[PDB]
Amino acid sequence: LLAEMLGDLSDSQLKVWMSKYGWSADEQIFICXXXXXXXXXXXXXXXXX
Amino acid sequence: KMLGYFSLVGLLRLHSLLGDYYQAIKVLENIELNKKSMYSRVPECQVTTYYYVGFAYLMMRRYQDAIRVFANILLYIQRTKSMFQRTTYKYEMINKQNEQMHALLAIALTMYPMRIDESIHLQLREKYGDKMLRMQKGDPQVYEELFSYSCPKFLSEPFLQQLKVFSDEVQQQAQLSTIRSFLKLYTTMPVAKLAGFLDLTEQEFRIQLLVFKHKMKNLVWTSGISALDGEFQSXXXXXXXXXXXXXXXXXXXXXXXX
Amino acid sequence: KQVQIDGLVVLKIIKHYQEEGQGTEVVQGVLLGLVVEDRLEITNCFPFPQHTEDDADFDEVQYQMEMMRSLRHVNIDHLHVGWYQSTYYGSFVTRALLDSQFSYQHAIEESVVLIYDPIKTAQGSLSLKAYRLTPFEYMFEEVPIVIKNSHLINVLMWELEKKXXXXXXX
Amino acid sequence: GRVVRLHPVILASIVDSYERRNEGAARVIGTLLGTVDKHSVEVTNCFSVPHNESEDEVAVDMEFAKNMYELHKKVSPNELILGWYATGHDITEHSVLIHEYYSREAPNPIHLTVDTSLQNGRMSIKAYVSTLMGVPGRTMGVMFTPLTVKYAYYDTERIGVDLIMKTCFXXXXXXXXXXXXXXXXXXXXXXXXXXXXXXXXXXXXXXXXXXXXXXXXXXXXXXXXXXXXXXX
């Protein structure tokens, strides 16, 4: 699929682009608390008020 | 210097009508000047400046800046959905121009947020309300037809708008939003359900392509796409909760203060 | 040893003593609280009615039982940790007051006697002390009294001249 | 009546009453004493009451009122029974009905809300007497009139407060924590019943536009959520 998307490349040409971006084949080509509590307290107080 | 600013704005507008987009944008960038001189001299000038800003925003990819300038020139629905009401001081012809500007803004406005507002706008006209309904429907066939019928409105000079370019671009963005609206939220999704939904889109082959393309956009996230199986997979929370609590408190404050 | 006196306990004792002073009849009441460690917390007090009898036998067990039961419906539910009186004579003038304390000590050996002077108490000077009996020796000794107030109480007190879970955790 | 003065002792007594139970959710209720025979009501003392609330309904111990007041009278007849207080922080739906009970002891009834949480610095106290403005062509409807408050002290208390602020110038708690933990270990059902309650309140308000009842329900639900957060 990658070779198709790159313009129908031969396996050799595809290798050039995989090499350029560091992609490698795998199985396939490998490509890739306290404060909170305080906040709640304030919010609660506001609600109560 | 207010008169000079007006001359700049008029000249920029003329250039835009017969002029290139970038130079006009640069003029707009120079152009802004203190509000107060304009306010003292006349009501209308400020509205004209707002309209110019809106036009620049429309030329600009972002619709946010224009959304603010247009609302100030004319009242607009606020974040938190509160009505924004504009002053009627400006001369009636100027006010009509402002209304036209507001009608233009709807196009920017729809992009900015939501949802189905035309309350300030007259109920009877189907020109804008119909367009709103079609967007709500999420089906292009109605949208396309709306452009086709109200072809005349878009045209209104002919060379200046030979191809309807902006409206078409806007519609294509508009079509995409609904699909993102499902917005994944599913760990793993049947292909057939996706196909049924993507089928509605005009290209049959789009889902194999249309779905992958959406991922490239990044509006919506697809997992397991292009898989042999063929089925798509699909502290932070605390912060979100805290945010909501804040909004609730804000609403209460406004209530108490009121 | 330290007696911690709460805000309402101190204000009630000063109020009662002064009211007693106008009366010209000595005022006594009971202190409610908790024996913690060696230290004693006085969280509240209540006044006993004036009696013709002086010192001991002043106490009215029917009044006390009723008051204690009705408070219990009230939240505090705190042991009698001693008694307070206002006595003019100084210093250590009267033998009679001490025997009262012996009666309290026999009921609960940790009991404390507080004495306040409502006449000599003036702005900047509260005249108060706390005693226990010793267990040629003297009969009794005095332990300094500190005051405990919550943050909520501190804010509340500041309205004069204005121009729960936490406590549990602690 | 034009206004209300409250002694610092009353503020501290309401806080002390609330403190002993150690319940954030719970609101405590009691009696206020003082003098209401002029346009300035002076609130100078108080005592706690046993009080329980179930659903809309609440129970007050009438015998407790009479028996404690009778002892208060033996100490100082000048401090009359003039109303009631609760820890709020806000007016509650049952308050006009509770107020009608206190009216039997004395009238007009006076309600002091003491915000023992002290969310707002300016006021630890809100004062109300029940009155109806009335509607023409219609029967008058009861409502609370809000009266201005100030904190004021006689010399004894002024001296006392100044002395107290000079330096500035557990088993029950454990049980409560255990109860909170139990609530947490159950909160999925209590959530779904607080969701329903919330909806109910909204319904009431809609009818009014009953409304008060719905509002109360909504408030209760919110309170229950807040208590769940605090526990966590």
PDB file of N, CA, C and O in Angstrom, chain B residues 74-114:
ATOM      1  N   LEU B  74     -23.131  44.443  15.286  1.00  0.00           N
ATOM      2  CA  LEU B  74     -24.510  44.012  15.472  1.00  0.00           C
ATOM      3  C   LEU B  74     -24.584  42.995  16.606  1.00  0.00           C
ATOM      4  O   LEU B  74     -23.612  42.293  16.881  1.00  0.00           O
ATOM      5  N   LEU B  75     -25.735  42.919  17.266  1.00  0.00           N
ATOM      6  CA  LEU B  75     -25.905  41.995  18.381  1.00  0.00           C
ATOM      7  C   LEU B  75     -25.786  40.545  17.921  1.00  0.00           C
ATOM      8  O   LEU B  75     -26.296  40.175  16.864  1.00  0.00           O
ATOM      9  N   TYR B  76     -25.110  39.730  18.725  1.00  0.00           N
ATOM     10  CA  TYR B  76     -24.922  38.318  18.413  1.00  0.00           C
ATOM     11  C   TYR B  76     -25.111  37.452  19.654  1.00  0.00           C
ATOM     12  O   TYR B  76     -24.898  37.910  20.777  1.00  0.00           O
ATOM     13  N   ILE B  77     -25.512  36.201  19.450  1.00  0.00           N
ATOM     14  CA  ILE B  77     -25.700  35.277  20.559  1.00  0.00           C
ATOM     15  C   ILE B  77     -24.357  34.933  21.196  1.00  0.00           C
ATOM     16  O   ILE B  77     -23.389  34.623  20.502  1.00  0.00           O
ATOM     17  N   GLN B  78     -24.288  35.142  22.507  1.00  0.00           N
ATOM     18  CA  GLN B  78     -23.059  35.006  23.281  1.00  0.00           C
ATOM     19  C   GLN B  78     -22.739  33.576  23.688  1.00  0.00           C
ATOM     20  O   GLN B  78     -23.612  32.708  23.690  1.00  0.00           O
ATOM     21  N   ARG B  79     -21.482  33.341  24.048  1.00  0.00           N
ATOM     22  CA  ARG B  79     -21.098  32.080  24.656  1.00  0.00           C
ATOM     23  C   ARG B  79     -21.863  32.013  25.968  1.00  0.00           C
ATOM     24  O   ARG B  79     -22.041  33.032  26.636  1.00  0.00           O
ATOM     25  N   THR B  80     -22.335  30.820  26.317  1.00  0.00           N
ATOM     26  CA  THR B  80     -23.266  30.637  27.429  1.00  0.00           C
ATOM     27  C   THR B  80     -24.683  30.990  26.971  1.00  0.00           C
ATOM     28  O   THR B  80     -25.616  31.044  27.772  1.00  0.00           O
ATOM     29  N   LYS B  81     -24.823  31.218  25.668  1.00  0.00           N
ATOM     30  CA  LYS B  81     -26.117  31.439  25.031  1.00  0.00           C
ATOM     31  C   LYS B  81     -26.946  32.609  25.566  1.00  0.00           C
ATOM     32  O   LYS B  81     -28.165  32.496  25.682  1.00  0.00           O
ATOM     33  N   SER B  82     -26.305  33.733  25.880  1.00  0.00           N
ATOM     34  CA  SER B  82     -27.072  34.903  26.274  1.00  0.00           C
ATOM     35  C   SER B  82     -27.146  35.865  25.093  1.00  0.00           C
ATOM     36  O   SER B  82     -26.169  36.044  24.366  1.00  0.00           O
ATOM     37  N   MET B  83     -28.306  36.484  24.907  1.00  0.00           N
ATOM     38  CA  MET B  83     -28.507  37.436  23.819  1.00  0.00           C
ATOM     39  C   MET B  83     -27.558  38.626  23.912  1.00  0.00           C
ATOM     40  O   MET B  83     -27.284  39.130  25.001  1.00  0.00           O
ATOM     41  N   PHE B  84     -27.019  39.031  22.774  1.00  0.00           N
ATOM     42  CA  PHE B  84     -26.224  40.236  22.729  1.00  0.00           C
ATOM     43  C   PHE B  84     -27.069  41.235  21.973  1.00  0.00           C
ATOM     44  O   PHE B  84     -27.400  41.024  20.807  1.00  0.00           O
ATOM     45  N   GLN B  85     -27.418  42.328  22.636  1.00  0.00           N
ATOM     46  CA  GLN B  85     -28.228  43.357  21.973  1.00  0.00           C
ATOM     47  C   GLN B  85     -27.464  44.639  21.615  1.00  0.00           C
ATOM     48  O   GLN B  85     -26.894  45.303  22.481  1.00  0.00           O
ATOM     49  N   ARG B  86     -27.468  44.972  20.324  1.00  0.00           N
ATOM     50  CA  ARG B  86     -26.812  46.173  19.791  1.00  0.00           C
ATOM     51  C   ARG B  86     -27.622  47.471  19.917  1.00  0.00           C
ATOM     52  O   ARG B  86     -28.852  47.445  19.948  1.00  0.00           O
ATOM     53  N   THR B  87     -26.917  48.599  19.983  1.00  0.00           N
ATOM     54  CA  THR B  87     -27.542  49.927  20.002  1.00  0.00           C
ATOM     55  C   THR B  87     -28.160  50.325  18.656  1.00  0.00           C
ATOM     56  O   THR B  87     -27.616  50.015  17.597  1.00  0.00           O
ATOM     57  N   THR B  88     -29.275  51.048  18.726  1.00  0.00           N
ATOM     58  CA  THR B  88     -30.032  51.475  17.550  1.00  0.00           C
ATOM     59  C   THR B  88     -29.696  52.904  17.119  1.00  0.00           C
ATOM     60  O   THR B  88     -30.380  53.484  16.275  1.00  0.00           O
ATOM     61  N   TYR B  89     -28.648  53.466  17.712  1.00  0.00           N
ATOM     62  CA  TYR B  89     -28.285  54.868  17.511  1.00  0.00           C
ATOM     63  C   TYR B  89     -27.951  55.213  16.058  1.00  0.00           C
ATOM     64  O   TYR B  89     -28.282  56.300  15.583  1.00  0.00           O
ATOM     65  N   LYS B  90     -27.292  54.295  15.359  1.00  0.00           N
ATOM     66  CA  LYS B  90     -26.836  54.546  13.994  1.00  0.00           C
ATOM     67  C   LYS B  90     -28.001  54.791  13.033  1.00  0.00           C
ATOM     68  O   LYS B  90     -29.091  54.249  13.211  1.00  0.00           O
ATOM     69  N   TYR B  91     -27.758  55.622  12.022  1.00  0.00           N
ATOM     70  CA  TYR B  91     -28.803  56.058  11.098  1.00  0.00           C
ATOM     71  C   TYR B  91     -29.409  54.878  10.347  1.00  0.00           C
ATOM     72  O   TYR B  91     -28.713  53.927   9.994  1.00  0.00           O
ATOM     73  N   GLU B  92     -30.718  54.945  10.125  1.00  0.00           N
ATOM     74  CA  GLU B  92     -31.479  53.795   9.649  1.00  0.00           C
ATOM     75  C   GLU B  92     -30.900  53.098   8.420  1.00  0.00           C
ATOM     76  O   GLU B  92     -30.939  51.873   8.338  1.00  0.00           O
ATOM     77  N   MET B  93     -30.383  53.855   7.459  1.00  0.00           N
ATOM     78  CA  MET B  93     -29.744  53.233   6.305  1.00  0.00           C
ATOM     79  C   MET B  93     -28.531  52.435   6.780  1.00  0.00           C
ATOM     80  O   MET B  93     -28.283  51.309   6.331  1.00  0.00           O
ATOM     81  N   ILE B  94     -27.795  53.026   7.717  1.00  0.00           N
ATOM     82  CA  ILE B  94     -26.626  52.385   8.300  1.00  0.00           C
ATOM     83  C   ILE B  94     -27.035  51.115   9.033  1.00  0.00           C
ATOM     84  O   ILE B  94     -26.336  50.114   8.984  1.00  0.00           O
ATOM     85  N   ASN B  95     -28.169  51.179   9.723  1.00  0.00           N
ATOM     86  CA  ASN B  95     -28.728  50.043  10.438  1.00  0.00           C
ATOM     87  C   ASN B  95     -29.107  48.915   9.491  1.00  0.00           C
ATOM     88  O   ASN B  95     -28.913  47.748   9.806  1.00  0.00           O
ATOM     89  N   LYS B  96     -29.668  49.271   8.340  1.00  0.00           N
ATOM     90  CA  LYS B  96     -29.998  48.294   7.310  1.00  0.00           C
ATOM     91  C   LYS B  96     -28.724  47.635   6.799  1.00  0.00           C
ATOM     92  O   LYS B  96     -28.679  46.420   6.574  1.00  0.00           O
ATOM     93  N   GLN B  97     -27.682  48.445   6.628  1.00  0.00           N
ATOM     94  CA  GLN B  97     -26.397  47.922   6.185  1.00  0.00           C
ATOM     95  C   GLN B  97     -25.869  46.943   7.226  1.00  0.00           C
ATOM     96  O   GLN B  97     -25.316  45.897   6.890  1.00  0.00           O
ATOM     97  N   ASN B  98     -26.051  47.298   8.492  1.00  0.00           N
ATOM     98  CA  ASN B  98     -25.640  46.470   9.616  1.00  0.00           C
ATOM     99  C   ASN B  98     -26.389  45.148   9.641  1.00  0.00           C
ATOM    100  O   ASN B  98     -25.818  44.116   9.962  1.00  0.00           O
ATOM    101  N   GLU B  99     -27.678  45.196   9.327  1.00  0.00           N
ATOM    102  CA  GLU B  99     -28.508  44.003   9.234  1.00  0.00           C
ATOM    103  C   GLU B  99     -28.010  43.102   8.114  1.00  0.00           C
ATOM    104  O   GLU B  99     -27.971  41.879   8.258  1.00  0.00           O
ATOM    105  N   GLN B 100     -27.630  43.712   6.994  1.00  0.00           N
ATOM    106  CA  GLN B 100     -27.076  42.952   5.879  1.00  0.00           C
ATOM    107  C   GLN B 100     -25.780  42.283   6.321  1.00  0.00           C
ATOM    108  O   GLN B 100     -25.506  41.128   5.981  1.00  0.00           O
ATOM    109  N   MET B 101     -24.989  43.022   7.090  1.00  0.00           N
ATOM    110  CA  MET B 101     -23.729  42.519   7.615  1.00  0.00           C
ATOM    111  C   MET B 101     -23.975  41.336   8.539  1.00  0.00           C
ATOM    112  O   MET B 101     -23.229  40.370   8.520  1.00  0.00           O
ATOM    113  N   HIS B 102     -25.022  41.431   9.353  1.00  0.00           N
ATOM    114  CA  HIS B 102     -25.423  40.366  10.263  1.00  0.00           C
ATOM    115  C   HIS B 102     -25.846  39.125   9.491  1.00  0.00           C
ATOM    116  O   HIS B 102     -25.556  37.999   9.895  1.00  0.00           O
ATOM    117  N   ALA B 103     -26.554  39.340   8.387  1.00  0.00           N
ATOM    118  CA  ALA B 103     -26.963  38.244   7.521  1.00  0.00           C
ATOM    119  C   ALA B 103     -25.731  37.560   6.945  1.00  0.00           C
ATOM    120  O   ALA B 103     -25.674  36.333   6.858  1.00  0.00           O
ATOM    121  N   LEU B 104     -24.741  38.360   6.556  1.00  0.00           N
ATOM    122  CA  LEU B 104     -23.485  37.818   6.049  1.00  0.00           C
ATOM    123  C   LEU B 104     -22.773  37.019   7.136  1.00  0.00           C
ATOM    124  O   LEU B 104     -22.195  35.964   6.878  1.00  0.00           O
ATOM    125  N   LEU B 105     -22.826  37.545   8.355  1.00  0.00           N
ATOM    126  CA  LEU B 105     -22.161  36.961   9.508  1.00  0.00           C
ATOM    127  C   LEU B 105     -22.712  35.583   9.822  1.00  0.00           C
ATOM    128  O   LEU B 105     -21.950  34.667  10.129  1.00  0.00           O
ATOM    129  N   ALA B 106     -24.030  35.416   9.736  1.00  0.00           N
ATOM    130  CA  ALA B 106     -24.569  34.073   9.913  1.00  0.00           C
ATOM    131  C   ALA B 106     -23.654  32.998   9.335  1.00  0.00           C
ATOM    132  O   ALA B 106     -23.469  31.947   9.945  1.00  0.00           O
ATOM    133  N   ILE B 107     -23.080  33.261   8.165  1.00  0.00           N
ATOM    134  CA  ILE B 107     -22.198  32.286   7.533  1.00  0.00           C
ATOM    135  C   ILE B 107     -20.963  32.021   8.391  1.00  0.00           C
ATOM    136  O   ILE B 107     -20.542  30.872   8.553  1.00  0.00           O
ATOM    137  N   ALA B 108     -20.349  33.097   8.871  1.00  0.00           N
ATOM    138  CA  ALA B 108     -19.277  33.012   9.855  1.00  0.00           C
ATOM    139  C   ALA B 108     -19.797  32.465  11.182  1.00  0.00           C
ATOM    140  O   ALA B 108     -19.134  31.664  11.842  1.00  0.00           O
ATOM    141  N   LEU B 109     -20.986  32.917  11.565  1.00  0.00           N
ATOM    142  CA  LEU B 109     -21.576  32.588  12.860  1.00  0.00           C
ATOM    143  C   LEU B 109     -21.855  31.098  13.039  1.00  0.00           C
ATOM    144  O   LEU B 109     -21.629  30.544  14.114  1.00  0.00           O
ATOM    145  N   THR B 110     -22.349  30.454  11.986  1.00  0.00           N
ATOM    146  CA  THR B 110     -22.677  29.036  12.059  1.00  0.00           C
ATOM    147  C   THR B 110     -21.419  28.228  12.345  1.00  0.00           C
ATOM    148  O   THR B 110     -21.438  27.282  13.132  1.00  0.00           O
ATOM    149  N   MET B 111     -20.325  28.611  11.699  1.00  0.00           N
ATOM    150  CA  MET B 111     -19.037  27.964  11.907  1.00  0.00           C
ATOM    151  C   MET B 111     -18.542  28.142  13.340  1.00  0.00           C
ATOM    152  O   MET B 111     -17.981  27.218  13.930  1.00  0.00           O
ATOM    153  N   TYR B 112     -18.784  29.314  13.917  1.00  0.00           N
ATOM    154  CA  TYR B 112     -18.273  29.608  15.251  1.00  0.00           C
ATOM    155  C   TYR B 112     -18.826  28.667  16.323  1.00  0.00           C
ATOM    156  O   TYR B 112     -18.076  28.191  17.174  1.00  0.00           O
ATOM    157  N   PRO B 113     -20.130  28.408  16.317  1.00  0.00           N
ATOM    158  CA  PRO B 113     -20.669  27.458  17.298  1.00  0.00           C
ATOM    159  C   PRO B 113     -22.035  26.841  16.968  1.00  0.00           C
ATOM    160  O   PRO B 113     -22.105  25.910  16.166  1.00  0.00           O
ATOM    161  N   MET B 114     -23.097  27.349  17.589  1.00  0.00           N
ATOM    162  CA  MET B 114     -24.423  26.750  17.478  1.00  0.00           C
ATOM    163  C   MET B 114     -25.532  27.750  17.815  1.00  0.00           C
ATOM    164  O   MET B 114     -25.259  28.809  18.381  1.00  0.00           O
TER     165      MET B 114
END
